[PDB]
Structure formats: structure tokens, C-alpha cells
Design a protein around this ligand. Structure first.
Ligand SMILES: [Ca+2]
Length: 167
């Protein structure tokens, strides 16, 4: 497959808790804001139930902050061409009932090209997909996933299989 993003299924990353948020996971930048005073636990899990390869990224939400983007996992770099329309697909599920996530894509100056807003994540693996167009002249963009919703407290959200493909 020809994908714009890197390590979209976490296959290159050793299983275990992610402590180096910025650089511990190839193709991704994880971030926790200072208003989250009880930090989440990001963990790459080897699991037979992984939709893609052997591994998934698990995010356990303990505290939350002031905005849902205060807990995020961002795919970057994402290599694209100006004017092209892309399909974004990712798989997600949660440990408990009631999880919410927003899947977004935008540029390095923080202009957003598109998102799936407040998606209802269930206890079963489901695909979440949308289209977006690179409407400016950027070639290296980013794909921020927001997890810091109050509804997620106590929950673990699992993601796998990010693929951003020419449409
Ligand atoms: Ca995987």
C-alpha cells in the first residue's frame, strides 16, 4: 500500500509504556498538557486482537485538562502533495462504554483540513474514515488525535491501523 503516514500500526515500536512522548514512537508525536495533573498512560501493547500486525497503541485516561487536545497522539510527518484529496482511515475501540475521540488532520501552522468530530468509540473495533483535501501548498502535514474528553476518564482507548491514502 502507498500511505502518507509512517508506522500507522505501531509495528516498528517496541511493546511497553511510552515514556518518550515526542520521539518514543516512530511516525508519531504524543503530547500531554500541564493542566492534566494525573497523566495518561500511553502503551504499545502486543495483542492477538490487534487489527493490524501484532501491536496497538493504548491510551489510559486518568485526569483531564481544559481542552480535549491536552491529550493527543499526532501522526507526523505525513507526506502529501498540494491539491490532492486523501482518504483517512483508522480503527479504534475502548475498554469501557462511553468513549469519545476526534480524529483530525492539519498543517504545521495548525490550519485544519478536516476532522471526524466527537466520534463515539465502542468496546468493539470499528473503522473511522473521512476525506480531506490539501487545500494549500503544504507537503508535510500532521494528523492530531484528541483524547482529553471528560467522558474518557477511567477508560482505555485503543487505536491501530492509521492509513492516509491518495483517494
Ligand atoms: Ca498494529
Amino acid at each position: 500500500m502507498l500511505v502518507a503516514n509512517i508506522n500507522g500500526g505501531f509495528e516498528s515500536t517496541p511493546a511497553g509504556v511510552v515514556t518518550d512522548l515526542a520521539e518514543g514512537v516512530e511516525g508519531w508525536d504524543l503530547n500531554v498538557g500541564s493542566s492534566v495533573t494525573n497523566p495518561p498512560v500511553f502503551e504499545v501493547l502486543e495483542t492477538s486482537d490487534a487489527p493490524e500486525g501484532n501491536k496497538v497503541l493504548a491510551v489510559t485516561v486518568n485526569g483531564v485538562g481544559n481542552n480535549p487536545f491536552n491529550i493527543q497522539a499526532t501522526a507526523l510527518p505525513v507526506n502529501v502533495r498540494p491539491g490532492v484529496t486523501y482518504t483517512y482511515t483508522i480503527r479504534a475501540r475502548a475498554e469501557q462504554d462511553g468513549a469519545v475521540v476526534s480524529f483530525t488532520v492539519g498543517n504545521q501552522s495548525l490550519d485544519e483540513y478536516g476532522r471526524l468530530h466527537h466520534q463515539q468509540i465502542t468496546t468493539e473495533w470499528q473503522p473511522f474514515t473521512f476525506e480531506f483535501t490539501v487545500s494549500d501548498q503544504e507537503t508535510v502535514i500532521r494528523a492530531p488525535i484528541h483524547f482529553g474528553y471528560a467522558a474518557n476518564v477511567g477508560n482505555t482507548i485503543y487505536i491501530d491501523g492509521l492509513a492516509i491514502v491518495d483517494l
